[PDB]
């Protein structure tokens, strides 16, 4: 998370950390608890190539990474069939836990938006995670969960910005319909924030608008962060998630 | 280059090294001399974002990198308009040299294939370059130009191989029509070989079949190297480069 | 630490962590609280060249590095005047804290040994710290304080071991009288463990025998860890630190 | 080499490169050909611990590293018996080539100084090598041999400079009689230049004054480069190398 501040213990109960086995259970991606047995993340975290489920654990909401680890095994990874690279869409994945979680007030699920919600610019949105604090700068110990308010951008404005200082034809779409844009040069998500949720408060409810997907660097000029648009994939999500 | 051997001084006169300015004029990509003023390379080398032409030089065929440098400036970089990421196609770009080259027997152009040439499996093809010798293993000094004979694979076989041990739906194409497949677990191109030519001897002539583009690792099982299919982009190439 | 295990919360109350300012207050050395306003460390941590006292803080006994930081400023660094390189001796330093600490049961001082204590082989000794877990392998998060029981070796035996597979003349001392040897191929201290205490239980008391100083690699054959012998420097220590 | 320029093909015929086996025969140290079968280098290159002679080769004077390699095996490594660390003296070693070299005009030996030569300040001295071009900055391809003219400094001036911004007692000798000082903030030797010769033109002859040994960083203020004084070790050299 580029910009923002440390998140209070009360906020973001649906935030999850994905761990990979090595010299320790290392954080590599974020995710959101969308159902007591289902985690929504980004496909580029776990795909396109198949990984060993044994080398993967899930950690639910914790203020400081690695301090009070209670790691949960995963029974299934479901990656969108249309996925190969993050920039070309379908950057969405589901992880099914071995067992469902006993949801408390400190740890509970996020609401997915209704199919009609567009999330227009000027929407109050937050992105949370334990990713890089800047370009090639890791989040320093004790690894607090960070939060940043990000400005939503109209897809066509963002697509135009991505064409500035690029050789790509103006008629060729860089930012697509299954994507969402947010952030500026002070506020953005970074590496290790992928899969993490972009949440907006709509009608007094916290809905998950997007999943951290990609961008050209972190908080670079004319390169806002691109998120997978959750509304676009609700049918696919609901084919597995109740 | 994974596998193969050091190339003799006589072979591959069209091979070029692209250099980027830093503490030295560092090799980052390969390319091929297709016309005395034009270099054919991969778009992911120079794009999608526009770079300063001043920080880019071209080095023609040399046996050992950096030892006898005669660096040439570039007046134009033309990246295919449909390009953004290597895996999603249009990974092709042209570089116009500020001055034409005096083509000798040791340094001369490669012939582009006729639009109809398909390059079927069992074709004798070579890939050349100064890229990594293995995964995360740089080519050691004195940096000799390497060559490897690579087996051509049918696109459908190759698209099927890329689906093995992948979550991508079988009905979703990974290897597109503007792409070509070559190599195995012993023979492949690697990082720093991009833009480099895949040449095949057809009817006693050396034709450039492809441009080193992408792959999952280097010489990994069921992951052959993916090249940009030159035939697919001839019309775009010939919009800038003279036919004759 | 190479070998051993995570230390229980009750053990080693005198263990300290030295912090250097950067993107965060990073651990670079250990030390021991020998008096409520004095920390005993290794000179190679802070010298031979003078550093800014402002970029240095001290953290007292904590189970996991960085999680519950209460960083203390330092008013003075006193490096032994003979010191230049770790291998050539005098690898000892004192840090004076701006204010003394309120010593609890969880955080209190270590006893320095009497001048006569030799620490013979077969002594039960421990080395503690947050250093590397192996050669070029950092201690992984949540950075627990590690402990290892190390076998003491006689100086003449150890100097002989250091001459095996070395060009140095047999008559030339590598392991000097101001040094102590401990550890094997399974048990040793490593990089980031320097300054850290080597403690032995003698007559029901915990005495600091040494300070982590140097060695050839971590847990290598015929290369035990070399510690600064605290008894050798008691007069210098007591010139600044109250007994 | 920090500062200076690429050396012409005619200059420094005695310069050698020491190679270690790995993914390629990599340059790690410099040296000088003092006799057709003998290379003079620094002991910290090859010691204090004994290495496998099989994994070590010698390359004679070449303009660009790795281009036209003609690697020579080594039969014997003789490290000064008093050596353990570079800063504490005796940083000198000899390599005996498996067979003597056919000395040409482009590749020949350097003249060792007479025992009486002191090399006073204001002497025109050069240091050559393929070491780092700055702190943590490797020499870029095609790896040309570099050369830099370095100002000689009196040992007492040097020792005093090494005490500025250091905790070491003023009466504690850091720079000793078996050492020589040269260089400033623009001109110095660096990592990978060790073993490399410091040559001075005296009475129309090129004499090897020193061997690149140590320093605090490269071209840092009040930290000139320390070289092993060849005159100090002539008796030891001549015990193995013919006059
Ligand atoms: C997988 C995940 O950790 C990252 C982070 C998303 C980046 N977000 C913003 N706002 N920049 N996603 C990726 O790594 C996907 N690929 C890319 O973002 C690349 N186009 C840039 C790679 C780079 O600069 O490191
Ligand atoms: C840009 C160029 O040097 C490389 C060479 C392709 C590797 N060749 C074969 N045969 N596998 N092109 C790329 O690296 C394009 N991106 C990818 O290949 C990615 N799938 C992996 C990128 C990476 O290694 O980080
Ligand atoms: C300064 C302190 O953290 C280290 C650790 C002592 C190592 N303990 C054992 N048993 N090996 N002390 C030093 O780094 C002093 N210099 C050396 O130990 C060198 N001889 C080796 C350097 C290295 O391995 O990196
Ligand atoms: C072994 C050899 O390549 C170097 C060269 C000495 C640096 N020369 C000048 N003129 N500054 N010798 C060493 O690395 C020996 N140890 C040291 O120099 C240490 N005092 C500093 C630690 C380090 O930078 O390695």
| Two tokens, residue B168 | 């991508």
Cβ separation of D142 and B69 shorter than 8 Å?
yes
Taking CA atoms only, the protein residue closest to ligand 1 atom 12 is A214
Catalytic residues of A: 44, 91, 194
| D155 three-state secondary structure | helix
Three-point CA angle B3, B7, B8, nearest 5°: 150
Burial class (CB in 10 A: 0-12, 13-18, 19+), C151: middle
Say which ligand is closest to the CA of B153.
2
For residues C179-188, one letter each, b for 16 or more C-beta atoms within 10 angstroms of the residue's C-beta and e for the rest, the string is: bbbbbbeebb
Q: Which helix (H) or strand (E) holds B45?
A: helix B43-46
CA within 13 Å, CB half, D188 = 25
User: Contact at 8 Å (CB) between A131 and A196?
Assistant: yes
Minimum CA–CA partner of A43 in chain B: B167
Cα(first)–Cα(last) distance of chain D, in Å? Answer: 31
Q: Is B215 in the pocket of ligand 2 (CB under 6 A)?
A: yes
d(CA A183, CA A186): 8
Q: Which residues make Cβ contacts (< 8 Å) with residue A29, sequence separation at least 6?
A: A17, A18, A41, A42, A45, A46, A192, A194, A195, A196
- Ramachandran angles phi, psi of A217, nearest 5°: 65, -170
d(CA A12, CA C188): 43
Cβ separation of B77 and A167 shorter than 8 Å?
yes
Set of chain D residues whose Cβ sits within 8 Å of the Cβ of C85: 85, 87-88
| DSSP state, residue D137 | B
CA A150 to chain centre: 13
User: Contact at 8 Å (CB) between B39 and B189?
Assistant: no
| C-alpha torsion sign, points C119, C121, C122, C124 | positive
d(CA B151, CA D216): 55
d(CA C101, CA C33): 10
CA within 13 Å, CB half, D44 = 20
Resolution of this entry in Å? Answer: 2.7
Across the interface, of C87, C165, C172, the residue whose CB is closest to D82 is: C172
d(CA B218, CA B132): 9
Candidates C44, C80, C163, C193; catalytic one: C44
Q: Which residue has the tokens 């007492």?
A: D156
d(CA C228, CA C234): 12
Burial class (CB in 10 A: 0-12, 13-18, 19+), C126: buried
CA separation (Å) from D106 to A95, B30, D11, D57? Answer: 69, 37, 8, 20
d(CA C88, CA D88): 7
User: Contact at 8 Å (CB) between C98 and C71?
Assistant: no
Across the interface, of C81, C167, C172, the residue whose CB is closest to D168 is: C81
d(CA A114, CA A95): 22
Taking CA atoms only, the protein residue closest to ligand 2 atom 13 is B214
d(CA D230, CA D243): 15
User: Contact at 8 Å (CB) between B210 and B229?
Assistant: yes
Q: Which residues make Cβ contacts (< 8 Å) with residue C231, sequence separation at least 6?
A: C113, C114, C115, C116, C117, C118
Mutate to test the interface with B, among A76, A168, A170 (most CBs of B within 10 A): A168
CA separation (Å) from D22 to A2, A54, B1, B126, D57? Answer: 41, 35, 19, 29, 12
d(CA D127, CA D198): 5
Q: Is C191 in the pocket of ligand 3 (CB under 6 A)?
A: yes
User: Contact at 8 Å (CB) between B17 and B62?
Assistant: yes
d(CA D133, CA D142): 13
The residue count for chain C: 243
Set of chain D residues whose Cβ sits within 8 Å of the Cβ of B21: none
Four-point Cα dihedral A57, A63, A64, A65, nearest 10: 10
User: Contact at 8 Å (CB) between D4 and D148?
Assistant: yes
d(CA D13, CA C15): 57
User: Is B91 annotated in the active site?
Assistant: yes
| Two tokens, residue B197 | 């030519």
Q: How many CB atoms lie within 10 A of CB B177?
A: 10
Across the interface, of A23, A67, A137, the residue whose CB is closest to C142 is: A67
CA separation (Å) from D25 to B89, C164, C178? Answer: 41, 27, 41
d(CA B16, CA B101): 12
d(CA B12, CA B31): 11
Beta bridge mates, C149: C126
d(CA D162, CA C84): 10
Q: Which residues make Cβ contacts (< 8 Å) with residue B181, sequence separation at least 6?
A: B152, B153, B154, B155, B157, B158, B175, B224, B225, B226, B227
Set of chain A residues whose Cβ sits within 8 Å of the Cβ of B47: 166-168
Domains of chain B, start order: 1-12+110-231 (no CATH), 13-109+232-244 (2.40.10.10)
CA D99 to chain centre: 22
Cis-peptide, bond into residue A238, ω within 30° of zero: no
Nearest to D193 by CA among D39, D18, D46, D64: D18
d(CA B142, CA D26): 11
d(CA B142, CA C42): 44
For residues C72-110, one letter each, b for 16 or more C-beta atoms within 10 angstroms of the residue's C-beta and e for the rest, the string is: bebeebbbbebbbbbbbbbbbbbbbbeeebeeeeebebb
Output helix, strand, coil percentages for chain B, rounded to the nearest 5.
10, 35, 55
Q: Is C190 in the pocket of ligand 3 (CB under 6 A)?
A: yes
| Two tokens, residue D107 | 């590749």
Q: How far apart are the CA of B155 and the nearest CA of chain D, in angstroms?
A: 36
Nearest to A117 by CA among A231, A212, A199, A228: A231
User: Contact at 8 Å (CB) between D198 and D126?
Assistant: yes
SS (H, E, C) chain A: CECCEECCCCCCCCEEEEEECCCCCEEEEEEEEEECCEEEECHHHHCCECCCHHHEEEEECCCECCCCCCCEEEEEEEECCCCCCHHHCCCCEEEEECCCCCCCCCCCCCECCCCCCCCCCCCEEEEEECCCCECCECCCCCCECEEEEEEEECHHHHHHHHHCCECCCCCCCCCCCCEEEECCCCCECCCCCCCCEEEEEECCEEEEEEEEEECCCCCECCECEEEEEHHHHHHHHHCCCC
Nearest to D95 by CA among D145, D57, D50: D57
Method: X-ray
CB pairs under 8 A between A and C: 25
d(CA B46, CA B58): 13
Q: Which residue has the tokens 């069992």?
A: B122
**DSSP per-residue codes, B134-188:** BTTBPPPTT-BPEEEEEEEE-HHHHHHHTTTTB-S-TTS-SS-TTEEEE--SSSB
Using most ligand atoms within 8 A of CB, pick from C45, C86, C151 the residue to mutate for ligand 3.
C86
Provide the pairing of β-strand B56-60 with B124-129.
unpaired
d(CA C183, CA C181): 7
Q: Which helix (H) or strand (E) holds D19?
A: strand D15-20
Four-point Cα dihedral C55, C59, C63, C66, nearest 10: -30
Q: How far apart are the CA of A208 and the nearest CA of chain B, in angstroms?
A: 24
User: Contact at 8 Å (CB) between D193 and D212?
Assistant: yes
SS (H, E, C) chain C: CECCEECCCCCCCCEEEEEECCCCCEEEEEEEEEECCEEEECHHHHCCECCCHHHEEEEECCCECCCCCCCEEEEEEEECCCCCCHHHCCCCEEEEECCCCCCCCCCCCCECCCCCCCCCCCCEEEEEECCCCECCECCCCCCECEEEEEEEECHHHHHHHHHCCECCCCCCCCCCCCEEEECCCCCECCCCCCCCEEEEEECCEEEEEEEEEECCCCCECCECEEEEEHHHHHHHHCCCCCC
Set of chain A residues whose Cβ sits within 8 Å of the Cβ of C142: 66-67, 69
| DSSP state, residue D186 | S
| Two tokens, residue B227 | 């090249």
User: Is C91 annotated in the active site?
Assistant: yes
Say which ligand is closest to the CA of A185.
1
Beta bridge mates, A205: A202
User: Contact at 8 Å (CB) between A77 and A40?
Assistant: no
d(CA A14, CA A103): 10
Cα(first)–Cα(last) distance of chain A, in Å? Answer: 31
CA C7 to chain centre: 16
B119: left (phi over 0), alpha (psi -120 to 50) or beta: left
d(CA B12, CA B14): 6
Nearest to B230 by CA among B124, B112, B83: B112
Q: How far is the CA of A2 from the centre of ligand 1 (A)?
A: 13
Q: How far apart are the CA of A21 and the nearest CA of chain C, in angstroms?
A: 12
User: Contact at 8 Å (CB) between A127 and A182?
Assistant: yes
User: Contact at 8 Å (CB) between A29 and A45?
Assistant: yes
Burial class (CB in 10 A: 0-12, 13-18, 19+), A221: exposed
Nearest to A44 by CA among A229, A214, A231: A214
Rg (CA), chain D: 17
d(CA B127, CA B224): 13
CA separation (Å) from B148 to B6, B182, C42? Answer: 9, 11, 56
Cβ separation of D137 and B69 shorter than 8 Å?
no
Cβ separation of A165 and B49 shorter than 8 Å?
yes
d(CA A159, CA A168): 11
d(CA C44, CA C85): 7
d(CA A147, CA A136): 19
- Range C157-165, long-range pairs (CB < 8 A, 24+ positions): C157/C121, C157/C181, C158/C224, C158/C226, C161/C222, C161/C223, C161/C224, C162/C216, C162/C222, C162/C223, C164/C222, C165/C222, C165/D49, C165/D50
| Two tokens, residue A66 | 């690695």
Cis-peptide, bond into residue D48, ω within 30° of zero: yes
């Amino acid at each position: 998370i580029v910009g923002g501040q440390e998140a209070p213990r009360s906020k973001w109960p649906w935030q999850v950390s994905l761990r990979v086995h090595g010299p320790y259970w290392m954080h590599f991606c974020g995710g959101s608890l969308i159902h007591p047995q289902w985690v929504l993340t980004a496909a580029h975290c776990v795909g396109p190539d198949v990984k060993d489920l044994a080398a993967l654990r899930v950690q639910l909401r914790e203020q400081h990474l690695y301090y009070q680890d209670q790691l949960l095994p995963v029974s299934r990874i479901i990656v969108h069939p249309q996925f190969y690279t993050a920039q070309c869409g379908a950057d969405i994945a589901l992880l099914e836990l071995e067992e469902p979680v006993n949801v408390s007030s400190h740890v509970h699920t996020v609401t997915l938006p209704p199919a009609s919600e567009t999330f227009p610019p000027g929407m109050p949105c937050w992105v949370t995670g334990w990713g890089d604090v800047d370009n090639d700068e890791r989040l320093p110990p004790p690894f607090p969960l960070k939060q940043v308010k990000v400005p939503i951008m109209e897809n066509h404005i963002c697509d135009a910005k991505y064409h500035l200082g690029a050789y790509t034809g103006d008629d060729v779409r860089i930012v697509r319909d299954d994507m969402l844009c947010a952030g500026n040069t002070r506020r953005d998500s970074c590496q290790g924030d992928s899969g993490g949720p972009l949440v907006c408060k709509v009608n007094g409810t916290w809905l998950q608008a997007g999943v951290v997907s990609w961008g050209e660097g972190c908080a670079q000029p004319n390169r806002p962060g691109i998120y997978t648009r959750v509304t676009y994939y609700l049918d696919w999500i609901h084919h597995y998630v109740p």
